[PDB]
Ligand binder design. Structure first.
Ligand code: HEM
Ligand SMILES: [Ca+2]
Ligand SMILES: [Ca+2]
Length: 329
Protein backbone atom coordinates (compact mmCIF):
# COMPACT_ATOMS: atom_id res chain seq x y z
CA UNK A 1 0.00 0.00 0.00
CA UNK A 2 0.99 3.60 -0.61
CA UNK A 3 0.02 6.19 1.99
CA UNK A 4 -0.87 9.87 1.59
CA UNK A 5 2.67 11.20 1.38
CA UNK A 6 4.11 8.34 -0.65
CA UNK A 7 5.54 6.25 2.16
CA UNK A 8 4.58 2.60 1.85
CA UNK A 9 3.35 -0.13 4.18
CA UNK A 10 2.12 -3.70 3.65
CA UNK A 11 -1.40 -3.16 5.05
CA UNK A 12 -3.10 0.15 4.29
CA UNK A 13 -4.82 0.57 7.67
CA UNK A 14 -1.29 1.22 8.92
CA UNK A 15 -1.03 4.46 6.96
CA UNK A 16 -2.66 6.24 9.89
CA UNK A 17 0.54 5.62 11.87
CA UNK A 18 2.88 7.68 9.66
CA UNK A 19 1.68 11.10 10.87
CA UNK A 20 1.58 9.70 14.41
CA UNK A 21 5.19 8.47 14.08
CA UNK A 22 6.31 11.89 12.84
CA UNK A 23 4.43 13.68 15.65
CA UNK A 24 5.74 11.58 18.52
CA UNK A 25 9.31 11.63 17.11
CA UNK A 26 9.34 15.40 16.91
CA UNK A 27 7.18 16.36 19.90
CA UNK A 28 7.32 13.56 22.49
CA UNK A 29 10.76 12.04 21.99
CA UNK A 30 12.57 15.35 21.38
CA UNK A 31 13.87 14.49 17.94
CA UNK A 32 13.95 10.70 18.28
CA UNK A 33 16.10 10.52 21.49
CA UNK A 34 16.62 7.52 23.93
CA UNK A 35 15.99 9.58 27.07
CA UNK A 36 13.40 10.19 29.77
CA UNK A 37 10.27 10.18 27.57
CA UNK A 38 11.28 6.99 25.75
CA UNK A 39 12.01 5.29 29.09
CA UNK A 40 8.73 6.42 30.61
CA UNK A 41 6.78 5.34 27.51
CA UNK A 42 8.36 1.91 27.65
CA UNK A 43 7.41 1.56 31.33
CA UNK A 44 3.85 2.52 30.37
CA UNK A 45 3.55 -0.39 27.94
CA UNK A 46 4.01 -2.77 30.86
CA UNK A 47 1.78 -0.97 33.36
CA UNK A 48 -1.01 -0.98 30.79
CA UNK A 49 -0.56 -4.54 29.54
CA UNK A 50 0.05 -6.45 32.76
CA UNK A 51 -3.42 -5.58 34.06
CA UNK A 52 -4.69 -8.88 32.72
CA UNK A 53 -5.50 -12.20 34.37
CA UNK A 54 -7.62 -15.10 33.02
CA UNK A 55 -9.38 -15.25 36.41
CA UNK A 56 -8.87 -11.89 38.12
CA UNK A 57 -9.78 -9.98 34.96
CA UNK A 58 -8.45 -6.79 33.43
CA UNK A 59 -8.33 -6.05 29.71
CA UNK A 60 -4.56 -6.16 29.26
CA UNK A 61 -3.04 -3.90 26.61
CA UNK A 62 -6.21 -1.84 26.24
CA UNK A 63 -5.31 1.76 27.05
CA UNK A 64 -7.06 1.48 30.41
CA UNK A 65 -4.21 3.24 32.25
CA UNK A 66 -4.92 6.39 30.18
CA UNK A 67 -8.72 6.15 29.77
CA UNK A 68 -9.19 5.24 33.43
CA UNK A 69 -6.19 7.28 34.63
CA UNK A 70 -7.88 8.73 37.73
CA UNK A 71 -8.37 5.15 38.95
CA UNK A 72 -5.18 3.41 37.81
CA UNK A 73 -2.58 6.13 38.42
CA UNK A 74 -3.63 6.06 42.08
CA UNK A 75 -2.58 2.41 42.54
CA UNK A 76 0.66 2.36 44.58
CA UNK A 77 2.26 0.05 42.02
CA UNK A 78 1.76 2.81 39.43
CA UNK A 79 3.74 5.43 41.37
CA UNK A 80 5.18 8.03 38.99
CA UNK A 81 3.17 6.82 35.98
CA UNK A 82 1.00 9.95 36.07
CA UNK A 83 3.66 12.06 34.35
CA UNK A 84 3.82 10.04 31.14
CA UNK A 85 0.06 9.43 31.08
CA UNK A 86 -0.45 13.21 31.19
CA UNK A 87 2.12 13.68 28.44
CA UNK A 88 0.55 11.04 26.16
CA UNK A 89 -3.09 12.07 26.66
CA UNK A 90 -3.10 15.04 24.25
CA UNK A 91 -1.51 12.83 21.58
CA UNK A 92 -4.23 10.17 21.89
CA UNK A 93 -6.97 12.83 21.70
CA UNK A 94 -5.44 14.47 18.62
CA UNK A 95 -4.87 11.33 16.56
CA UNK A 96 -7.12 8.55 15.28
CA UNK A 97 -6.01 5.34 17.01
CA UNK A 98 -7.15 3.76 20.29
CA UNK A 99 -5.33 4.52 23.54
CA UNK A 100 -4.22 0.87 23.70
CA UNK A 101 -2.70 1.07 20.24
CA UNK A 102 -1.02 4.40 21.00
CA UNK A 103 0.71 3.18 24.17
CA UNK A 104 2.19 0.16 22.44
CA UNK A 105 3.14 2.14 19.32
CA UNK A 106 4.91 4.87 21.30
CA UNK A 107 6.84 2.21 23.25
CA UNK A 108 7.98 0.45 20.09
CA UNK A 109 8.94 3.68 18.37
CA UNK A 110 10.85 4.76 21.47
CA UNK A 111 12.87 1.57 21.72
CA UNK A 112 13.79 1.93 18.04
CA UNK A 113 15.50 5.26 18.89
CA UNK A 114 17.93 3.64 21.30
CA UNK A 115 21.41 2.57 20.22
CA UNK A 116 21.48 -1.20 20.35
CA UNK A 117 17.70 -1.30 20.18
CA UNK A 118 15.43 -3.62 18.27
CA UNK A 119 12.26 -3.34 16.15
CA UNK A 120 9.30 -4.63 18.17
CA UNK A 121 6.40 -6.04 16.13
CA UNK A 122 3.39 -3.74 16.19
CA UNK A 123 -0.27 -4.59 15.53
CA UNK A 124 -3.15 -2.12 15.07
CA UNK A 125 -6.81 -2.43 16.10
CA UNK A 126 -7.21 -2.69 19.88
CA UNK A 127 -10.68 -1.49 20.88
CA UNK A 128 -11.26 1.18 23.52
CA UNK A 129 -10.80 0.16 27.15
CA UNK A 130 -13.93 -1.28 28.75
CA UNK A 131 -13.06 -0.84 32.45
CA UNK A 132 -10.17 0.04 34.72
CA UNK A 133 -7.71 -2.70 35.60
CA UNK A 134 -8.18 -4.35 38.97
CA UNK A 135 -5.52 -3.23 41.46
CA UNK A 136 -2.72 -5.60 42.57
CA UNK A 137 -1.91 -6.96 39.10
CA UNK A 138 1.33 -5.00 38.63
CA UNK A 139 4.48 -6.54 40.19
CA UNK A 140 6.30 -4.43 42.80
CA UNK A 141 10.04 -4.48 43.49
CA UNK A 142 9.46 -5.69 47.08
CA UNK A 143 7.31 -8.67 46.04
CA UNK A 144 8.76 -12.12 46.62
CA UNK A 145 10.44 -13.62 43.50
CA UNK A 146 7.96 -16.47 43.45
CA UNK A 147 5.12 -13.91 43.62
CA UNK A 148 6.52 -11.88 40.69
CA UNK A 149 7.05 -15.02 38.63
CA UNK A 150 3.53 -16.33 39.43
CA UNK A 151 1.91 -13.00 38.52
CA UNK A 152 3.81 -12.79 35.27
CA UNK A 153 2.98 -16.48 34.70
CA UNK A 154 -0.70 -15.85 35.32
CA UNK A 155 -0.56 -13.14 32.63
CA UNK A 156 1.10 -15.70 30.32
CA UNK A 157 4.90 -15.42 30.70
CA UNK A 158 7.45 -18.09 31.55
CA UNK A 159 10.26 -17.32 33.97
CA UNK A 160 12.73 -16.93 31.12
CA UNK A 161 10.32 -14.47 29.42
CA UNK A 162 10.41 -12.31 32.53
CA UNK A 163 14.19 -12.13 32.24
CA UNK A 164 13.90 -11.14 28.57
CA UNK A 165 11.37 -8.38 29.34
CA UNK A 166 13.67 -7.01 32.03
CA UNK A 167 16.15 -6.05 29.30
CA UNK A 168 13.97 -2.91 29.49
CA UNK A 169 15.91 -2.04 32.67
CA UNK A 170 18.94 -1.51 30.41
CA UNK A 171 17.27 1.80 29.36
CA UNK A 172 15.70 2.82 32.62
CA UNK A 173 15.84 4.87 35.80
CA UNK A 174 13.92 5.25 39.06
CA UNK A 175 12.34 8.45 40.40
CA UNK A 176 10.24 7.10 43.28
CA UNK A 177 12.16 4.13 44.71
CA UNK A 178 14.60 6.57 46.25
CA UNK A 179 13.07 10.06 45.81
CA UNK A 180 16.29 11.70 47.01
CA UNK A 181 18.00 10.68 43.77
CA UNK A 182 15.46 10.84 40.97
CA UNK A 183 16.72 9.80 37.55
CA UNK A 184 19.14 7.19 38.88
CA UNK A 185 19.52 4.42 36.29
CA UNK A 186 19.50 0.65 36.73
CA UNK A 187 22.66 0.30 34.59
CA UNK A 188 25.59 2.51 33.68
CA UNK A 189 24.28 3.03 30.14
CA UNK A 190 20.61 4.14 30.36
CA UNK A 191 20.85 5.56 26.83
CA UNK A 192 22.05 2.26 25.31
CA UNK A 193 20.04 -0.94 24.97
CA UNK A 194 22.78 -3.37 25.99
CA UNK A 195 23.80 -6.09 28.40
CA UNK A 196 25.21 -3.82 31.13
CA UNK A 197 22.06 -4.28 33.23
CA UNK A 198 22.53 -8.05 33.36
CA UNK A 199 26.21 -7.67 34.22
CA UNK A 200 25.93 -4.95 36.87
CA UNK A 201 23.05 -6.56 38.79
CA UNK A 202 25.26 -9.64 39.23
CA UNK A 203 27.98 -7.75 41.05
CA UNK A 204 28.23 -7.79 44.85
CA UNK A 205 26.45 -4.82 46.33
CA UNK A 206 28.57 -2.10 47.94
CA UNK A 207 26.52 0.93 48.84
CA UNK A 208 23.23 2.76 48.83
CA UNK A 209 23.39 5.50 46.15
CA UNK A 210 21.04 7.69 48.21
CA UNK A 211 19.23 6.97 51.49
CA UNK A 212 19.09 3.56 53.21
CA UNK A 213 15.74 1.91 54.10
CA UNK A 214 13.81 2.45 50.82
CA UNK A 215 11.28 -0.29 50.26
CA UNK A 216 12.09 -2.40 47.18
CA UNK A 217 15.73 -1.32 47.03
CA UNK A 218 18.96 -3.12 47.98
CA UNK A 219 22.59 -2.08 47.81
CA UNK A 220 24.06 -1.16 44.44
CA UNK A 221 27.59 -1.82 43.22
CA UNK A 222 28.09 1.72 41.88
CA UNK A 223 27.57 5.29 42.93
CA UNK A 224 24.89 6.70 40.70
CA UNK A 225 23.26 3.32 40.02
CA UNK A 226 20.23 1.97 41.88
CA UNK A 227 19.42 -1.71 42.37
CA UNK A 228 15.87 -2.98 42.80
CA UNK A 229 15.34 -5.76 45.31
CA UNK A 230 13.46 -7.73 42.69
CA UNK A 231 16.27 -7.43 40.11
CA UNK A 232 18.86 -8.40 42.73
CA UNK A 233 16.83 -11.53 43.52
CA UNK A 234 15.92 -12.46 39.94
CA UNK A 235 19.62 -12.36 39.01
CA UNK A 236 20.23 -14.92 41.78
CA UNK A 237 17.13 -17.18 41.83
CA UNK A 238 17.55 -20.73 40.45
CA UNK A 239 14.53 -20.22 38.15
CA UNK A 240 16.05 -17.22 36.41
CA UNK A 241 19.77 -16.90 37.21
CA UNK A 242 21.14 -18.98 34.33
CA UNK A 243 18.95 -17.17 31.81
CA UNK A 244 19.96 -13.81 33.33
CA UNK A 245 23.64 -14.68 32.95
CA UNK A 246 23.08 -15.95 29.40
CA UNK A 247 22.14 -12.39 28.35
CA UNK A 248 25.57 -11.03 29.27
CA UNK A 249 27.57 -10.11 26.16
CA UNK A 250 24.81 -11.60 23.88
CA UNK A 251 23.36 -8.58 22.15
CA UNK A 252 21.52 -10.50 19.43
CA UNK A 253 19.73 -12.64 22.05
CA UNK A 254 18.78 -9.59 24.10
CA UNK A 255 17.36 -7.95 20.98
CA UNK A 256 15.50 -10.94 19.58
CA UNK A 257 14.01 -12.13 22.86
CA UNK A 258 13.02 -8.61 23.88
CA UNK A 259 11.26 -8.04 20.58
CA UNK A 260 9.36 -11.32 20.65
CA UNK A 261 8.35 -11.06 24.26
CA UNK A 262 7.37 -7.37 23.99
CA UNK A 263 5.13 -8.38 21.11
CA UNK A 264 3.50 -10.97 23.34
CA UNK A 265 3.10 -8.38 26.14
CA UNK A 266 1.61 -5.82 23.75
CA UNK A 267 -1.08 -8.36 22.89
CA UNK A 268 -2.23 -9.28 26.41
CA UNK A 269 -6.03 -9.26 26.42
CA UNK A 270 -6.01 -9.19 22.61
CA UNK A 271 -6.10 -11.60 19.67
CA UNK A 272 -3.36 -11.23 17.05
CA UNK A 273 -5.64 -12.73 14.37
CA UNK A 274 -8.12 -9.88 15.05
CA UNK A 275 -5.48 -7.18 14.52
CA UNK A 276 -3.55 -5.75 11.57
CA UNK A 277 0.24 -6.13 11.22
CA UNK A 278 1.90 -2.72 11.10
CA UNK A 279 5.40 -3.82 12.08
CA UNK A 280 7.02 -2.22 9.03
CA UNK A 281 6.23 1.29 10.36
CA UNK A 282 8.79 0.99 13.17
CA UNK A 283 12.09 2.72 12.28
CA UNK A 284 15.51 1.08 12.12
CA UNK A 285 17.46 1.44 15.37
CA UNK A 286 20.98 2.83 15.60
CA UNK A 287 23.82 0.40 16.09
CA UNK A 288 25.02 -0.70 19.51
CA UNK A 289 27.57 1.63 21.07
CA UNK A 290 30.14 0.11 23.42
CA UNK A 291 31.04 -3.43 24.37
CA UNK A 292 30.21 -5.59 27.37
CA UNK A 293 32.47 -4.89 30.35
CA UNK A 294 32.83 -4.89 34.10
CA UNK A 295 32.92 -1.39 35.60
CA UNK A 296 36.33 0.23 36.03
CA UNK A 297 38.29 -1.23 38.93
CA UNK A 298 36.17 -4.39 39.15
CA UNK A 299 37.15 -7.97 38.47
CA UNK A 300 35.52 -11.33 38.17
CA UNK A 301 35.89 -11.77 41.96
CA UNK A 302 33.25 -9.06 42.36
CA UNK A 303 30.63 -11.13 40.50
CA UNK A 304 28.21 -13.22 42.55
CA UNK A 305 27.93 -16.49 40.66
CA UNK A 306 24.36 -17.76 40.82
CA UNK A 307 24.00 -19.91 37.69
CA UNK A 308 24.57 -23.54 38.72
CA UNK A 309 25.27 -24.89 35.23
CA UNK A 310 27.82 -22.39 33.80
CA UNK A 311 30.39 -19.94 35.25
CA UNK A 312 29.94 -16.25 34.55
CA UNK A 313 31.93 -15.24 31.44
CA UNK A 314 35.23 -13.44 31.80
CA UNK A 315 34.73 -9.82 30.86
CA UNK A 316 37.34 -7.13 30.67
CA UNK A 317 36.99 -4.16 33.00
CA UNK A 318 36.97 -0.52 31.89
CA UNK A 319 40.41 1.06 32.50
CA UNK A 320 41.20 3.26 35.49
CA UNK A 321 39.58 3.87 38.92
CA UNK A 322 35.86 3.31 39.44
CA UNK A 323 33.68 6.31 38.67
CA UNK A 324 30.07 7.48 39.03
CA UNK A 325 27.05 7.07 36.83
CA UNK A 326 25.39 10.35 35.78
CA UNK A 327 21.61 10.56 36.34
CA UNK A 328 19.17 10.64 33.43
CA UNK A 329 18.46 14.35 32.73
C1 HEM B 1 9.10 -7.98 36.45
C2 HEM B 1 8.75 -7.11 37.41
C3 HEM B 1 9.11 -5.62 37.38
C4 HEM B 1 9.30 -4.81 38.46
C5 HEM B 1 9.17 -5.28 39.92
C6 HEM B 1 9.66 -3.50 38.03
C7 HEM B 1 9.91 -2.40 38.81
C8 HEM B 1 10.24 -1.15 38.38
C9 HEM B 1 10.46 -0.01 39.24
C10 HEM B 1 10.28 -0.04 40.77
C11 HEM B 1 10.82 1.02 38.48
C12 HEM B 1 11.15 2.46 38.93
C13 HEM B 1 9.90 3.34 39.04
C14 HEM B 1 10.25 4.64 39.72
O1 HEM B 1 10.42 4.66 40.97
O2 HEM B 1 10.36 5.67 39.02
C15 HEM B 1 10.84 0.58 37.09
C16 HEM B 1 11.16 1.35 36.00
C17 HEM B 1 11.04 0.93 34.68
N1 HEM B 1 10.49 -0.26 34.24
FE1 HEM B 1 10.44 -1.99 35.41
N2 HEM B 1 9.66 -3.51 36.65
C18 HEM B 1 9.33 -4.78 36.21
C19 HEM B 1 9.16 -5.13 34.88
C20 HEM B 1 9.23 -4.28 33.80
C21 HEM B 1 8.90 -4.65 32.45
C22 HEM B 1 8.37 -6.05 32.06
C23 HEM B 1 9.13 -3.61 31.66
C24 HEM B 1 8.90 -3.63 30.15
C25 HEM B 1 8.50 -2.54 29.49
C26 HEM B 1 9.63 -2.52 32.48
C27 HEM B 1 10.07 -1.28 32.06
C28 HEM B 1 10.54 -0.27 32.86
C29 HEM B 1 11.20 0.88 32.37
C30 HEM B 1 11.55 1.27 30.95
C31 HEM B 1 11.50 1.71 33.56
C32 HEM B 1 12.20 3.07 33.57
C33 HEM B 1 11.20 4.23 33.59
C34 HEM B 1 11.92 5.54 33.81
O3 HEM B 1 13.07 5.68 33.42
O4 HEM B 1 11.30 6.48 34.41
N3 HEM B 1 9.67 -2.98 33.79
N4 HEM B 1 10.47 -0.78 37.06
CA1 LIG C 1 -4.64 -2.02 30.79
CA1 LIG D 1 22.05 0.05 29.17
Amino acid sequence: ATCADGRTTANAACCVLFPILDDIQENLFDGAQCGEEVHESLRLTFHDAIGFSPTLGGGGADGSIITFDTIETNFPANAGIDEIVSAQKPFVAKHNISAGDFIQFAGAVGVSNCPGGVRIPFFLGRPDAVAASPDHLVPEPFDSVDTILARMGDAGFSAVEVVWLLASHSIAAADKVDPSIPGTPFDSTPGVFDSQFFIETQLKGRLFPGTPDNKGEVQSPLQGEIRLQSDHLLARDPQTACEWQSMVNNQPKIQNRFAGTMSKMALLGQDKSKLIDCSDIIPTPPALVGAAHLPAGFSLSDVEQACAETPFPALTADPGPVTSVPPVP
